[PDB]
Amino acid sequence: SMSYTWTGALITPCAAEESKLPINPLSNSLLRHHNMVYATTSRSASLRQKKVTFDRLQVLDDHYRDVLKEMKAKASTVKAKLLSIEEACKLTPPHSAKSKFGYGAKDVRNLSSRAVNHIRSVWEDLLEDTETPIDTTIMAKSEVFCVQPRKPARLIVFPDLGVRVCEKMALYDVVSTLPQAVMGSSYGFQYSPKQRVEFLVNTWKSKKCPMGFSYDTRCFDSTVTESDIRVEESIYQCCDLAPEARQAIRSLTERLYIGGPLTNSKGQNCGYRRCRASGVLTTSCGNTLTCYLKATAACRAAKLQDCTMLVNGDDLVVICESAGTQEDAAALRAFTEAMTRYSAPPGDPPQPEYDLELITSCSSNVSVAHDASGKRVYYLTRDPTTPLARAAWETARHTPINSWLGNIIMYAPTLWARMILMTHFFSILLAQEQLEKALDCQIYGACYSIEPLDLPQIIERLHGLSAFTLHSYSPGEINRVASCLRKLGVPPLRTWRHRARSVRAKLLSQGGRAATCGRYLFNWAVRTKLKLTPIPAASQLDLSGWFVAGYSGGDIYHS
Ligand SMILES: O=C(O)c1ccc(Cl)cc1NS(=O)(=O)c1cc(Cl)c(Cl)cc1Cl
Ligand SMILES: O=C(O)c1ccc(Cl)cc1NS(=O)(=O)c1cc(Cl)c(Cl)cc1Cl
Ligand SMILES: [Mn+2]
Ligand SMILES: [Mn+2]
């Protein structure tokens, strides 16, 4: 069937849309080529619509069925619990889109009478009505990028707030626990960056002659068929579930997940969806299971040897045993035709790689540096272009989520996050005297409230002390960073070192947590290094829950 059907009504914005980077003194000190940074808007919606609208092709074979049964056998060991309305409400982000039924996220979090009453009625409706399609709103997502030698806005589809809370009650525990039970070490969201690196490195070293590749499906959500979504439900149904949760899951699958009507911000009928909605609770878990299922079966069909998968939603990395240059090339090609038959055609043909550093997944790749002892240490890095463009944007404009904070945490060991992001943002926080102000950021899609002054302990707990002593980065990594800065008009690293020494000094002079930030985060900036000892507060942090599952598009808030 067609992934989408359109009436002609336009995808409209519900407020003014900014697309250009402002000329701001704070942002200009970080990035001078402001005309190269832009934000997507509804103006490009039609372009995206054209790309994601097509008829799907899907042929399932014995390998697919074999793997599905293997996954279901594992899912059968799961017992999922039903979340109370209170628990579900508390998972709702403070700035989540308000309901059209007289209440907003703040009301939900406060368990106000009207919000809770409506949520209950929505729940009872899911238990009683097993067929009526649930309405969804379609919007053009606002994301920041750097012009390329422009990307049309992505389309987000989500149901009302009441429905979103009900999804949590019925499925939060399932999407938080089932993926790991089914996919084991292949489920990527169970890993912190260091652990992801650990898995990739060990998986690579375990092969006699490793060969690996990233497989990028063209607009994955649009490739997801009704069959895929019902197969996904069949996996969830293997869990021990409360009667109402089982019905809610059955109803949500038929009324929302497999598809439904699309309404624009103006309340006009835009069309119909018959594929994955980006803004529902099951998107991350469902895409991961779907991608893992198809690729695991595809490997068998293509005869790839010892395929080890690492899946994060639609992002897939495969590491296997090489059978020779020509053999691998033909097998990868066969893999692609198998995935194509399963309705997971590639955006760009995958290419076999024989060096782990050359494998890129969602712009990220593993690289190596050295600690104080001179020992090799692998870490996760990525092209800094988008992180820098977004940092500049969030510097000049107030945004609900601070990607820069999430990037500092996830890429703390990188040359660019340390020299640029830490330097730039701490200097600004110092100047505005807002170091102790908690900010919101996202990790694997879930929203977290974080205090900048706790970054030292956070980073130590997640990356280890070596994150504050890495040096001697690879030539390729250094070159990528340097060339990126020239492209964006970002001052050279020598300038950032100078700024860091001054920022470091100021932080030390204030003592307390601030001083700790200066000592640990900016030790790289001084010749006479300071003895960095394990931070007491670090070993006392409760980061249990940060890396359990993916929740992108799931409207999740962890407090
Ligand atoms: O060339 C390097 O030094 C290098 C640095 C980082 C990475 Cl990710 C790969 C590299 N090359 S590689 O041949 O794929 C490689 C992979 C692993 Cl798993 C280990 Cl233990 C050592 C090397 Cl040599
Ligand atoms: O070598 C160190 O002691 C060191 C350790 C970590 C970091 Cl983030 C930077 C370090 N050196 S630095 O002087 O700041 C520096 C490094 C590079 Cl690669 C480049 Cl192009 C330019 C500069 Cl100005
Ligand atoms: Mn993805
Ligand atoms: Mn190498």
Swiss-Prot record:
Changing residue 362 to R: In strain: Isolate pCV-J4L2S. Mg(2+) 2 binds at residues 216, 314-315. It catalyses: RNA(n) + a ribonucleoside 5'-triphosphate = RNA(n+1) + diphosphate. The modification Phosphoserine is found at residues 29, 42. Activity is up-regulated by PRK2/PKN2-mediated phosphorylation. Binds 2 magnesium ion that constitute a dinuclear catalytic metal center. Residues 210-328 form the RdRp catalytic domain. Its cofactor is Mg(2+). It comes from the Viruses. It is found in: Host cytoplasm; Host endoplasmic reticulum membrane. It is a single-pass type IV membrane protein. The N-terminus is phosphorylated by host PRK2/PKN2. Changing residue 401 to V: In strain: Isolate pCV-J4L2S. Homooligomer. Interacts with non-structural protein 5A. Interacts with host VAPB. Interacts with host PRK2/PKN2. Interacts with host HNRNPA1 and SEPT6; these interactions facilitate viral replication. Part of the replication complex composed of NS2, NS3, NS4A, NS4B, NS5A and the RNA-directed RNA polymerase. RNA-dependent RNA polymerase that performs primer-template recognition and RNA synthesis during viral replication. Initiates RNA transcription/replication at a flavin adenine dinucleotide (FAD), resulting in a 5'- FAD cap on viral RNAs. In this way, recognition of viral 5' RNA by host pattern recognition receptors can be bypassed, thereby evading activation of antiviral pathways. This is RNA-directed RNA polymerase. It comes from Hepatitis C virus genotype 1b (strain HC-J4) (HCV). The lineage of its organism: Viruses, Riboviria, Orthornavirae, Kitrinoviricota, Flasuviricetes. The chain holds residues 2420 to 2982 of 3010 of the full protein.
